[PDB]
Amino acid sequence: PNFSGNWKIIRSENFEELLKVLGVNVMLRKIAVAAASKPAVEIKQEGDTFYIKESTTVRTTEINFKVGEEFEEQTVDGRPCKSLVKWESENKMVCEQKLLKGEGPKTSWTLELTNDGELILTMTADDVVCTKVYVRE
Numbered sequence: 001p002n003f004s005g006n007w008k009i010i011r012s013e014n015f016e017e018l019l020k021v022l023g024v025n026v027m028l029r030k031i032a033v034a035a036a037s038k039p040a041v042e043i044k045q046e047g048d049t050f051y052i053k054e055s056t057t058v059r060t061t062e063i064n065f066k067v068g069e070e071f072e073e074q075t076v077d078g079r080p081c082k083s084l085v086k087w088e089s090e091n092k093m094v095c096e097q098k099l100l101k102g103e104g105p106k107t108s109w110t111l112e113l114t115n116d117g118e119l120i121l122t123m124t125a126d127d128v129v130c131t132k133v134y135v136r137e
Contacts, residue, residue, distance in 0.1 A: 002113075003119065007136060009133070016029055021125060050066070096108050119133070
């Protein structure tokens with residue numbers, strides 16, 4: 001499976017409620033949600049090594065990791081964390097996140113590529129799941 005590409009969002013479900021349950025205030029949710037309607041996700045995969053950049057109008061995040069090796073990133077609500085990605089199957093990776101400072105809800109995310117060329121991101125915080133689906137440009 002090759003995740004490399006420029007990805008455009010085609011579905012999103014439960015994003016704002018995910019932010020809400022994480023205690024993100026209304027002002028910021030509105031902005032995040034407005035802005036997340038027009039994102040850009042760029043992925044460069046070389047075997048188990050990945051570079052992933054997401055951009056909205058108001059935020060940008062970039063990560064470089066190798067499956068199986070711990071790296072630093074942020075939770076969906078902007079909290080610094082140590083992450084580890086593992087392959088669940090040939091086309092699906094899963095990431096467990098641990099906060100660097102303090103405690104909080106258990107967060108994770110997964111990325112899977114479908115046979116039809118769609119990229120499915122799920123993000124979970126405890127028992128609230130958000131799904132987003134992308135296609136290549």
